[PDB]
């Protein structure tokens, strides 16, 4: 279910010219199903992408 969804989401990200990984979206389905506010989910990941940039 998680994989099937990840491919369609992967299509959308590519359109926006926004890079996310395969893995991120799949973890996202796990967090949603446990309950996560939409603001929170976005905020952790946005920061995590910037951290990765600075780090290398």
């Amino acid at each position: 279910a998680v994989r099937e969804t990840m491919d369609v989401l992967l299509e959308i990200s590519r359109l926006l010219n926004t890079g996310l990984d395969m893995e991120t979206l799949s973890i996202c389905v796990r967090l949603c199903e446990q309950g996560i506010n939409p603001e929170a989910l976005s905020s952790v990941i946005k920061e995590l992408r910037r951290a990765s940039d600075t780090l290398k």
Partner: protein
């Protein structure tokens, strides 16, 4: 819940397990502090918003395509909070005509 967050941190950043520390302390704290939802269970406003985004990025074609893939998600019946992943994508949208700040060794500044 924690295990999930740790896997997001360690994986993207690579294995320091003490140099991915920052994100992890950051992560538990940010989600645990409660707020009442905004842009939730109003998917009609969100679809419209992403279509405007496409219109802005000078990709009219991608907006009709997106709408088709959107309806494909509904039939699957999986992924409880659709809106949250859509909300995420839009935040990090960027136009094909600039690129946002990339710098490293930001601690020095």
């Amino acid at each position: 819940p924690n295990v999930l967050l740790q896997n997001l941190c360690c994986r993207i950043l690579g294995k320091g397990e003490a140099d991915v520390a920052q994100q992890f302390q950051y992560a538990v704290r940010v989600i645990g502090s409660n707020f009442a939802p905004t842009v939730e269970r109003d998917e009609f406003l969100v679809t419209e918003k992403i279509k405007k985004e496409f219109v802005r990025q000078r990709r009219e074609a991608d907006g009709a395509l997106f709408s088709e893939l959107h309806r494909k998600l509904q039939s699957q019946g999986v992924l409880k909070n659709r809106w949250s992943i859509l909300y995420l994508l839009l935040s990090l949208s960027e136009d094909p005509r600039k690129q946002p700040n990339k710098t490293s060794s930001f601690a020095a500044l």
